[PDB]
Write an enzyme that holds these catalytic residues in place. Structure first.
Site, mmCIF file in Angstrom:
data_model
loop_
_atom_site.group_PDB
_atom_site.id
_atom_site.type_symbol
_atom_site.label_atom_id
_atom_site.label_comp_id
_atom_site.label_asym_id
_atom_site.label_seq_id
_atom_site.Cartn_x
_atom_site.Cartn_y
_atom_site.Cartn_z
ATOM 1 N N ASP A 183 33.377 20.211 29.416
ATOM 2 C CA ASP A 183 34.317 21.350 30.688
ATOM 3 C C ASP A 183 35.053 20.459 31.305
ATOM 4 O OD1 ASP A 183 34.255 23.563 31.598
ATOM 5 O OD2 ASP A 183 33.679 22.927 33.652
ATOM 6 N N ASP A 185 37.021 22.499 34.249
ATOM 7 C CA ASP A 185 37.306 22.578 35.950
ATOM 8 C C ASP A 185 36.820 21.674 36.444
ATOM 9 O OD1 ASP A 185 39.995 24.776 35.386
ATOM 10 O OD2 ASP A 185 38.395 25.002 34.067
ATOM 11 N N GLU A 192 40.336 23.419 40.261
ATOM 12 C CA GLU A 192 40.327 24.942 39.304
ATOM 13 C C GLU A 192 41.634 25.095 38.861
ATOM 14 O OE1 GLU A 192 37.803 26.250 38.076
ATOM 15 O OE2 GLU A 192 36.918 23.886 38.695
ATOM 16 N N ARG A 228 39.431 36.902 38.540
ATOM 17 C CA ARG A 228 40.602 36.607 38.622
ATOM 18 C C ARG A 228 41.578 36.345 37.832
ATOM 19 N NH1 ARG A 228 36.979 31.734 38.520
ATOM 20 N NH2 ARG A 228 35.125 33.015 36.568
ATOM 21 N N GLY A 272 35.996 27.782 29.837
ATOM 22 C CA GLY A 272 36.034 29.426 30.527
ATOM 23 C C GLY A 272 37.942 29.646 30.882
ATOM 24 N N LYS A 316 30.230 28.834 25.889
ATOM 25 C CA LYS A 316 30.194 27.741 25.821
ATOM 26 C C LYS A 316 28.823 27.250 25.002
ATOM 27 C CE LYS A 316 32.740 26.569 29.418
ATOM 28 N NZ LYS A 316 33.143 25.888 30.596
ATOM 29 N N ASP A 339 29.481 21.516 35.272
ATOM 30 C CA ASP A 339 29.964 21.268 36.558
ATOM 31 C C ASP A 339 28.979 22.370 36.967
ATOM 32 O OD1 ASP A 339 32.387 22.944 36.804
ATOM 33 O OD2 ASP A 339 32.141 22.553 38.845
ATOM 34 N N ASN A 342 28.227 28.078 34.887
ATOM 35 C CA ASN A 342 28.510 28.890 34.392
ATOM 36 C C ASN A 342 28.490 27.292 32.330
ATOM 37 O OD1 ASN A 342 31.425 30.035 32.471
ATOM 38 N ND2 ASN A 342 33.168 27.990 32.810
HETATM 39 MG MG LIG Z 1 33.841 24.036 35.484
#
Ligand SMILES: [Mg+2]
EC number: 3.1.3.3
Length: 396
Positions: A183, A185, A192, A228, A272, A316, A339, A342
């Site tokens: 991943d 972020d 982020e 967001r 994402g 993902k 992490d 997600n």
């Molecule tokens: Mg992440």
């Protein structure tokens, strides 16, 4: 030669003992079957199984020559007939890792208890890292039907004792790992990104609420993505460039990829987030694959929608098997490192999923778990040691 005989030197280590023992053995009708020698903190163990003629092996000649030549230099030695003894040991059925900064004796002692509680022999232990985190590896053989309960056991132990625990299969296919996806972020990249952009639209507040509400498993990933990114509608798309300049790499990340290149890995990211922002850095890192969502722009300004198709959670996992297809690597040699919720579907589709600074919804399902924010600790979980890395680095 007829009958088998097992010989075993113990005692402080010194040079030449291994040579001395075998010259001496040459003088009797001796042919090897297995030899196992190690030195841990100077204690030498040496275990030679031979089969020699029942003639010599029923004679005191051999005994006296060995015993004499060993005890002379200051080590003990034993000699015993074998016949039934297993020639070469079975391999380990799982490998376990324990890491932490620090690893208390109580902690490590709890792992060994629950390992014992289940029938699992610790076949071997050794330390893999002294930096940045004490990490120790244990090859263990598991009773059939226990290894589900094993990771149950170990996760618990991990939580109560504040150490990271990890349980892989130690089998041939499963250990020629070849593919890793990160991943981005809060895994590969600090922070982020959708908050670095949010903060440019003075909506860093609202957005950071939702973001942690998502990464923990409380709102549909698409739904929280739209909302967001909705906050960014209005920003000049130049700001994308501004945020891809501020980005920092997770500590040790360069060393993680550089070493993952050494072992011939395909490395990719799967976010994402926003392709326009990973596309710069995923070039400089010379990555092999990038799957990411797209920000909509019009006349140079962000509209606050994302271009579909969206890479949701299950997107993902999709995102990885596509990579694993394109590079030809079956799923069971695939590594995934995330992490947050997600990434629940990626890590469970991968052959070895790794929760890194994970929200607890992740830790509950990842095949492994790292708490400490250093990405080089990903190397240890893959068969590497802090000694190897610094050797190979140091040569350039
Ligand atoms: Mg992440």
């Amino acid at each position: 030669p007829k009958v088998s005989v097992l010989i075993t030197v113990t005692g402080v280590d010194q040079p030449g003992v291994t040579a001395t023992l075998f010259e001496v053995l040459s003088r009797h009708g001796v042919e090897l079957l297995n030899v196992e020698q190690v030195v841990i903190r100077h204690r030498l163990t040496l275990g030679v199984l031979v089969c020699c003629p029942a003639d010599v092996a029923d004679g005191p000649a051999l005994r006296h020559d060995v015993e004499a030549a060993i005890r002379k230099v200051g080590l003990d030695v034993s000699i015993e007939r074998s016949d039934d003894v297993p020639i070469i040991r079975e391999p380990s059925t799982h490998t376990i890792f324990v890491l932490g900064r620090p690893i208390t004796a109580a902690a490590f002692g709890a792992v060994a208890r629950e390992v014992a509680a289940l029938g699992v022999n610790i076949d071997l232990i050794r330390g893999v890292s002294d930096y940045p985190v004490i990490g120790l590896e244990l090859r263990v053989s598991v009773p059939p039907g226990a290894d589900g309960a094993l990771r149950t056991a170990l996760n618990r132990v991990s939580s109560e004792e504040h150490v990271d625990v990890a349980v892989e299969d130690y089998t041939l296919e499963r250990r020629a790992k070849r593919l890793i996806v990160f991943d981005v972020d809060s895994t590969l990249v600090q922070g982020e990104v959708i908050e670095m952009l949010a903060a440019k639209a003075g909506a860093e507040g609202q957005v950071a609420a939702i973001t942690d509400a998502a990464m923990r498993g409380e709102l549909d990933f698409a739904q929280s993505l739209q909302q967001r990114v909705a906050t960014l509608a209005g920003l000049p798309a130049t700001v994308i460039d501004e945020v891809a300049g501020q980005l920092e790499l997770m500590p040790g990340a360069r060393t993680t990829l550089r070493t993952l290149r050494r072992l011939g890995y395909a490395c990719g990211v799967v976010a994402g987030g926003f392709a326009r922002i990973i596309e710069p850095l995923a070039e400089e890192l010379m990555l092999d694959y990038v799957a990411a969502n797209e920000l909509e722009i019009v006349d140079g300004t962000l509209t606050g929608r994302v271009v579909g198709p969206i890479i949701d959670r299950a997107g993902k996992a999709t995102a990885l098997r596509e990579f694993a297809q394109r590079a030809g690597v079956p799923m069971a040699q695939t590594v995934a490192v995330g992490d947050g919720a997600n990434d629940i579907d990626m890590l469970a589709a991968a052959g070895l999923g790794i929760a890194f600074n994970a929200k607890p919804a992740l830790r509950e399902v990842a095949d492994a778990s790292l708490s400490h924010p250093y990405l080089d600790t990903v190397l240890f979980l893959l068969g590497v040691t802090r000694g190897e890395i610094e050797a190979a680095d140091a040569i350039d």
